[PDB]
Amino acid sequence: MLEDLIGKAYLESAEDRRRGDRSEEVEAIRKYIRSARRTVVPNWNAEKVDAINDVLRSFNLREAEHLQFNTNWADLTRMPAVTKALMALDISGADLVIARGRLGVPGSGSLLVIMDSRGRLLSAAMSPPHVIHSMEVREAVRSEMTHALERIGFK
Amino acid sequence: LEDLIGKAYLESAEDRRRGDRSEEVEAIRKYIRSARRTVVPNWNAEKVDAINDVLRSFNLREAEHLQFNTNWADLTRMPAVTKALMALDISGADLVIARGRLGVPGSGSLLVIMDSRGRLLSAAMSPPHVIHSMEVREAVRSEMTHALERIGFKR
């Protein structure tokens, strides 16, 4: 499904017919997520993985298995959350990856991403650095996971 | 920023990293305030004017904008980031602000603030317009506002 719609969207942009995202594209992202047989999270922290899984369960989505690899190494790259997600994909071969880490440079706060089996970005959500807005991490993760799904029309 | 990046990288490397530090977030704000030239690749006057209205309200120098075809960013995996990098590579500016698609078709919008070496300082997102009927200038205004307030700017 996603390849079909990407090919079509790419042709649209190429022919200057692109005027934003289309309801069928958003729907396909939801369908991809709902049908994913294996979802993996590289984050090892139980509070964060449990928060993610709490939210998935609340949307009737299959829970994520977590990996147990050193994820500090992602923090020496330009987009840590995305690097961590790609690491999870490359190790696991999963259909869906959900990962959380730093947005960009030190100081830039947090980004949670939902990525597909070929390394593409389906949705995401962010929080300010904790030093700017205090929020218990489990609630930050819960809200980011919720926002990442609701923003593409999940109920 | 490189001095703080070095120290943050050493923390992560040595298993001492526990989130972003106040001094790091402060450094990002300083970098943004000190920028000699801010460039926006988005050509749409409505989007550029909304960005500039926000910058002005935060006492920041307004962005110049580029005029080139930005549709082609939409054939890449992270269109907003691609667009920002294109703006940086053409302009040599100190600060780039760019808005475009987050990821795959259907994935909504991402606004990024990028430094002179292509690193991500801050960002903000909106759902696809089909999901949230926000007027686009309100979408861009709110994204620009969120991207600055999340790192501690005050209007």
Describe the protein.
- The structure is a homodimer of 155-residue chains.
- With 155 residues, chain A is an alpha/beta fold.
- Chain A has 2 domains: 2-35, Helix Hairpins (Orthogonal Bundle); 36-155, Rossmann fold (3-Layer(aba) Sandwich), CATH 3.40.50.
- In chain A, 43% of the residues lie in helices and 17% in strands.
- Chain A has 5 helices and 5 strands.
- In chain A, strands 2-1-3-4-5 form a 5-stranded mixed β-sheet, with helices on both faces.
- In chain A, strand 1 (39-41), helix 3 (46-58) and strand 2 form a beta-alpha-beta unit.
- In chain A, helix 3 packs parallel to helix 5.
- The radius of gyration of chain A is 16 Å and the shape is globular.
- Chain A starts with a helix and ends in a 5-residue tail after the last helix.
- The interface between A and B is large, with 54 and 53 residues.
- It is classed as structural genomics, unknown function.
Instruction: Give the name of the CATH architecture of the largest domain in chain A.
Output: 3-Layer(aba) Sandwich
Instruction: Kindly provide the name of the CATH class of the largest domain in chain A.
Output: Alpha Beta
Query: What's the total helix number of chain A?
Result: 5
| Coarse shape of chain A | globular
* Structure classification of chain A: alpha/beta
Give the spatial strand order of the biggest sheet of chain A.
2-1-3-4-5
* Largest inter-chain contact set: A-B, 54 and 53 residues
- Helical amount among residues of chain A, as a percent range? 40-55%
> What is the count of distinct domains of chain A?
2
Oligomer: homodimer
Integer-rounded radius of gyration of chain A = 16 Å
**The CATH fourth-level homologous superfamily of the largest domain in chain A:** B12-dependent dehydatase associated subunit
CATH topology tier name of the largest domain in chain A: Rossmann fold
What is the element string of chain A, with H for helices and E for strands?
HHEHEHEEEH
Beta-strand share of residues of chain A: 15-25%
Span of the ends, CA to CA of chain A: 21 Å
Largest sheet of chain A: 5 strands, mixed
Number of strands of chain A: 5
Protein name (chain A): Conserved protein
InterPro entries (chain A): B12-dep_deHydtase_bsu, HcgB
Pfam family, one (chain A): HcgB
Organism (chain A): Methanothermobacter thermautotrophicus (strain ATCC 29096 / DSM 1053 / JCM 10044 / NBRC 100330 / Delta H)
